[PDB]
Amino acid sequence: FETRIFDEPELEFGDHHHHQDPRLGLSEAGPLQTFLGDVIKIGVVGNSKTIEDTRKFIETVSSGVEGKGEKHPNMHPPFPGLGNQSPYRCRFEIEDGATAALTKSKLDKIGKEPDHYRAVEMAVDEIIGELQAMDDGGSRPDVAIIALPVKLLERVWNAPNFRGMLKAKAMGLSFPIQIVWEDVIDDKVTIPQKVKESSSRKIQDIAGRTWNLMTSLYYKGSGRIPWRRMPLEGEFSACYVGISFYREADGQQLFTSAAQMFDERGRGFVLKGRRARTESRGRHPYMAREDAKKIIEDVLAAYKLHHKTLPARVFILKTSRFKDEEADGIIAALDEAGTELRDLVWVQESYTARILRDGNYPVLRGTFVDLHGKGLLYTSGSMPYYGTYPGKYDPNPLLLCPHHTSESTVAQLAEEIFSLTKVNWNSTQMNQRLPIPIRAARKVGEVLKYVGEGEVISADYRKYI
Amino acid sequence: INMLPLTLPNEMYIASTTYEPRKAIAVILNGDGPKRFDWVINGGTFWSFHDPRTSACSEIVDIDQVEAINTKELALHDDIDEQNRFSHLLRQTLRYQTDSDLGWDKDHKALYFRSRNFAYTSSKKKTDANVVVRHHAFSPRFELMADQWYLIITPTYYYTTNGYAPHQFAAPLLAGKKRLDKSAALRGQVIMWHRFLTQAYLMFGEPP
RNA sequence: AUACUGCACAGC
DNA sequence: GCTGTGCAGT
Ligand SMILES: [Mg+2]
């Protein structure tokens, strides 16, 4: 069993300051597609206290946040605001006529509590009515913040899913919503939990919280990736694809398929896929050819629509072992498209064998031991740059089987997904464990459950993230 | 490193019957002979590493339709349903082999001891603790990698009030004792289980 | 639903 | 083995 270690790939922003940290490499570098100064308009929905708190937060973060950093103070820089030392080279702004407000009578009508469906859909409709008033007005916002009040939060929390229907109705709009709880805008009252009743939810330090929220606002408003994943030694335009299977919330066991692409530098495309038949547990909604061929053809159609070319490498990775009919369909479609390099890997969030315990420090982030046929990828770990392991106990590997084998070995696959791990947009945290086509599965399922009938499904991960 | 290199026997006794795995265990518990717990659940056949002529009854199958083959051609088989059957047979064989001072779980599937310090001979420091109440258990898992079968070892604790009464709410304490690892608490347990297993139809090798 | 890591329970 | 839910610490 041969062993090796791996180092994390560097991140490129403006062809300067090749750094691993997504926060320090934003603070002291030139971020991607920067300008001399840009304005991003925010829109807020909620009662007047939430709007006042949101405006106070937005106009107080520009002064500066502390940067003490008790555990490895290079984990985050002190946030200096978006003034002269702007980490995104912009200046945020909020329009006066953009921000909305709902009266107490409608909130009490929601809080009448008939059951946990009617109040939920009434609050949903009213929110999209306020959002349509936002959109049809003159002050159109780039990113909308839904800072719902604590009473409506408890009315939603008394239980469907509010978030799924909210994103399903906002998919037909022009701006992506950026729902943020009222505790997150510096309010002294903590939100009550669901099961533990008389308990207070926890939250990070203020500086890292502001860093994550402001970077998420930066993506959701400005349509531009912050950090790119520059390729390794000898790569081309690949088509990293994950496949997920979800069950609807109306009591139907139809394990419907999806498809997610993260081809160019981290840009993602979410496609609906085909129907769902023949699942005792769920392994083949790619039955024979009639689903898999035209699902891959639709994937290549989207790739031809954007890139006006064809992918050189396809790296279909999932978590459930496939069958011979699905493999035959994938191989036939890729041969009809003339694909050069292919891989069909199933990745295990399982395989209880935990090894390489030696050494005084815990095991490093990135370490490959290749069992004779299958690899043991350690994607979460520790570094001397971060000093220690501030996480929890022992990390969890993944094991990769190239079922229906192809023209690649396991070292290339392990190095590729260890390049693929830290291109995460929901977080600027460094120690990540899952590839983004795998982590995106739950996030796209929780929204695509509630689309329902046949409409324009569209393809943008910005709605789901 | 924690994985364990099983060594297979050279003979396999097979048979073909039309029985059912409930009344068969019923007659084998109301029998008047040596009881054995490595005869496999009848998925259509009957596979074991034992001669049924010298068993207790062996009335599951008739005598003239028993065959003996080599385990090399059956261990190297694709069509992984047979691999699952082989893992089933190996699990029953392991449950029968070290069955005297052990107990098998029904929910979490572990092998708990049933206070004993259990000192074992080793060249390193004598790190022996209470094993028979904070027990010591492990979940065996069979996996065939490359040309060789392998057991996956996973340590855990089974909690009991007096050794016979089951636990009630000791799961958070079990989780808290699990959350204790500083590169000494797991390697020592793997070493202890290897030393116990090294001391029979299945031969166990040295973990890497 | 600012997050990530980790842990527990249920279903097939 | 893989889909669903719920917390605790940074
Ligand atoms: Mg998000």
Residue numbers in the entry:
A (entry chain A): 3 to 161, 180 to 485
B (entry chain B): 166 to 279, 286 to 303, 318 to 384, 399 to 407
What is written in the article reporting this PDB entry?
The structure of the inactive complex, determined at 3.34 Å, showed that it is monomeric with the DREN domain being flexible. The cryo-EM images indicated that the complex with 21-nt tDNA is mostly filamentous, while the complex with 13-nt tDNA is exclusively monodisperse. The results showed that the collateral nuclease activity against ssDNA, measured by a fluorophore quencher (FQ) assay, is correlated with tDNA length, with 19- and 21-nt showing full activity, 17- and 15-nt showing weaker activity, and 13- and 11-nt showing no activity. The observation that the inactive complex (with 13-nt tDNA) is monomeric and the active complex (with 21-nt tDNA) is filamentous indicates that the tDNA loading would first disrupt the dimerization, and then induce the filament formation during the propagation of guide–target heteroduplex. To figure out how 13-nt tDNA disrupts the dimerization, two copies of the inactive complex structure were superimposed onto the structure of the guide-bound complex, revealing a severe steric clash between the two duplexes, as the dimer configuration could only accommodate duplex shorter than 8 bp. The mechanism by which tDNA disrupts NbaSPARDA dimerization is similar to that in DdmDE, a short pAgo-related host defense system. From structures of active and inactive complexes, we observed that NbaAgo, together with the APAZ domain, creates a positively charged channel to accommodate the B-form guide–target heteroduplex, forming extensive interactions.
The short Argonaute-based bacterial defense system, SPARDA (Short Prokaryotic Argonaute and DNase/RNase-APAZ), utilizes guide RNA to target invading complementary DNA and exhibits collateral nuclease activity, leading to cell death or dormancy. In this study, we investigated the SPARDA system from Novosphingopyxis baekryungensis (NbaSPARDA) and discovered an unexpected filament configuration upon target DNA binding, which strongly correlated with collateral nuclease activity. Based on these structures, NbaAgo is divided into a MID domain (amino acid (aa) 12–50) and a PIWI domain (aa 250–485), while DREN-APAZ is divided into a DREN domain (aa 1–146), a bridging loop (aa 146–161), and an APAZ domain (aa 161–442). Collectively, these experimental results led to a detailed working model of NbaSPARDA that highlights the importance of the transition in assembly form during the activation process. gRNA loading, tDNA engagement, and guide–target heteroduplex propagation lead to the “monomer-dimer-monomer-filament” transition of SPARDA complex.
